[PDB]
Write a protein that binds this ligand. Structure first.
Ligand code: ZN
Lengths: 46, 54, 146, 49
């Protein structure tokens, strides 16, 4: 079992290391998204 | 059967509105009118013929 | 009735309760169909081990944890797909293995929350997350090596 | 309630068996954490003053 194909490279980015967040909705299936829902604001704390 | 509101996720009761029966949530104004037939079969196991033991 | 706001069934994979009228994939075939069958980019969410096989470069130390926050940009490793469906990650002298994580069906939006100013910031929706990968050390190889 | 049901299970028989509990909870006006905590506290007794 040799690496015949798919020798993909891996790069690293530090531009958004401190500005990248992951938001997941446990109650909203992936089929329906909030792209069409107009948002108003977002409160947050550092 | 059990259905949930996409808004908050609570259970949806069925109620008679002003035009047609509709699913509705008890904690938000979300509603959904019924257009076509909706069925939920359970297929109970029946009784079987049991035999003449002896 | 609006078509993009119908009632959702309990099964997130079969929410199509009313219509107008999935086999468990593998990482090798996943990447194959992501690159060969199509060319559109995809956002993945992989889980790396706690400590990477490296040393914090001039980070003031101790054999502490080495995460991506200490490594610099550029090529850090390669991704190999051997025969029989093996998917490995060569991150230096050692080689980890990549497997498919829990099949998430709920909405996962990868966004960038950049606080450019101390009073007003920008939230940038980068994309959607669909698949999850898990990278694990090949402990068998590390043990049979020495 | 959707999250609770997903945590219990996604199998048809699981939801069929858990339906009665959801209905009994819906009969009451408990829908938030504060209301449930107040109900629990009402169902709590002091350890003899
Ligand atoms: Zn609702």
């Amino acid at each position: 079992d040799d690496p015949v194909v798919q020798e993909i490279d891996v790069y690293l980015a530090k531009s958004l290391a401190e500005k990248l967040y992951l938001f997941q909705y446990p109650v909203r299936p992936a089929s329906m998204t909030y792209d069409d829902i107009p948002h108003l604001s977002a409160k947050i704390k550092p | 059967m059990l259905l949930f509101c996409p808004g908050c996720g609570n259970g949806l009761i069925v109620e008679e509105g002003q035009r047609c029966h509709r699913f509705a949530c008890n904690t938000c104004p979300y509603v959904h009118n019924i257009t076509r037939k909706v069925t939920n079969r359970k297929y109970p196991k029946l009784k079987e013929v049991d035999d003449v033991l002896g | 009735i609006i078509n993009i706001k119908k009632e959702k069934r309990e099964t997130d994979e079969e929410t199509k309760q009313i219509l107008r009228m999935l086999p468990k994939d593998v990482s090798v075939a996943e990447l194959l169909r992501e690159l060969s069958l199509t060319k559109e980019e995809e956002l993945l969410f992989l889980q790396l081990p706690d400590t990477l096989p490296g040393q914090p470069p001039t980070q003031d130390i101790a054999e502490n944890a080495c995460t991506l926050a200490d490594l610099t940009e550029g090529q850090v490793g390669k991704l190999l797909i051997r025969k029989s469906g093996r998917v490995q990650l060569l991150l230096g002298k050692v080689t980890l293995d990549v497997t498919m994580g829990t099949a998430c069906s709920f909405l996962q939006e990868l966004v960038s929350v950049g606080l450019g100013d101390s009073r007003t910031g920008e939230m940038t929706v980068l994309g959607h997350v669909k698949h999850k990968l898990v990278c694990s050390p090949d402990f068998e190889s590390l043990l049979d090596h020495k | 309630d959707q999250e609770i049901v997903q945590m219990i299970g996604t199998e048809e028989h699981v939801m069929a068996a858990f339906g009665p509990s959801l209905e009994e909870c819906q009969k009451a006006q408990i829908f938030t954490q504060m209301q449930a905590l107040k109900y629990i506290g009402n169902k709590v007794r002091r350890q003899r003053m």
